[PDB]
Amino acid sequence: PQITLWQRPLVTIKIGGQLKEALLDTGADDTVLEEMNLPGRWKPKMIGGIGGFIKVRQYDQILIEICGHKAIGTVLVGPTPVNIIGRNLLTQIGCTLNF
Amino acid sequence: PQITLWQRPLVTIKIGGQLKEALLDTGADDTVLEEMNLPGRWKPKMIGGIGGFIKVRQYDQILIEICGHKAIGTVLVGPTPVNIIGRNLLTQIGCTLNF
Ligand SMILES: COc1ccc(CN[C@@H](C(=O)N[C@H](C(=O)NCc2ccc(OC)cc2O)C(C)C)[C@H](O)[C@H](Cc2ccccc2)NC(=O)[C@@H](NC(=O)OCc2ccccc2)C(C)(C)C)cc1
């Protein structure tokens, strides 16, 4: 779809049997989601944004149905205000920035 | 231009006689520029991001030439680690997301 940016670019995802709503973020190198129940092994990791750093659980190799498109990658779960899809999955679903 | 997301979507801007590089960010509602010399009257403000809030100064109707395209908006200067062009200027230069 073509998304124009007058409103936040939100899109529905299905992760872990679960229906979520996430923000399509080109200035996010990483995918970070609010605390949720996810099956598996996780590593601790820390990431920065403006304001500073949060600790997150890097889950590796999680399938995500991003707007009907399946992708598999590293998903970080942690105490974010909004669910963020970062360029590690945006390149998977073929997303480009156009102006 | 069409920009893919294999690397950070960086672009050159010219703000106030100064040449800089900024991150074209759909997940940013606002444009926050690293500390710099802007002429003007600013108001304080606090913006939020993932690791907390920071205090930034709001300077309104600042011309920015983003990749040769001119736009005039509200720019916040403050302690960001990266310069960020957010959806308040991205919609101005005609930027859309596509997949
Ligand atoms: C509601 O709050 C939100 C809304 C969205 C987010 C998601 N992130 C964005 C971001 O912070 N957006 C800000 C925003 O729109 N916030 C809404 C907002 C809320 C309240 C408000 O009050 C008036 C004003 C506002 O504008 C703008 C201002 C930068 C940007 O996409 C933001 C831009 C940036 C880039 C690099 C370094 C620092 C900042 N991106 C990041 O924070 C991303 N950071 C980044 O990619 O580096 C990651 C990393 C570091 C170290 C080791 C491993 C990885 C990431 C953490 C999401 C992956 C977080 C919180």
For chain A, domain boundaries: 1-99
Residue B10 at interface with chain A, using a CB cutoff of 8 Å: no
Helix (H, G, I), strand (E, B) or coil at B96: strand
Active site residue B30: no
CA of B83 to the centre of ligand 1 (A): 12
Buried b (16+ CB within 10 A) or exposed e, A12-40: ebebbeeebebbbbbbbebbbbeeeebee
Domain A1-99 CATH assignment equals 2.40.70.10 = yes
Q: Are the beta carbons of B46 and B55 closer than 8 angstroms?
A: yes
- Min CA distance, A91 vs chain B (Å)? 6
Q: Are the beta carbons of B55 and B2 closer than 8 angstroms?
A: no
Helical spans, DSSP H, in chain A? 87-90
Please indicate whether, in this complex, the C-beta atoms of B95 and A93 are within 8 angstroms of each other.
Answer: no
Beta bridge partners of A96: B4, B98
Phi, psi (deg, nearest 5) at residue B88: -80, -20
Distances (CA, A) of A7 to A70, B2, B88, B91, B94: 24, 21, 10, 10, 14
Shortest CA distance from B49: residue in chain A: A50
The data reach a resolution, in angstroms, of 2.5
d(CA A57, CA A42): 5
Residues enclosing ligand 1, CB less than 6 A?
Answer: A 25, 27-30, 32, 47-50, 81-82, 84, 86; B 25, 27-30, 32, 47-50, 81-82, 84, 86
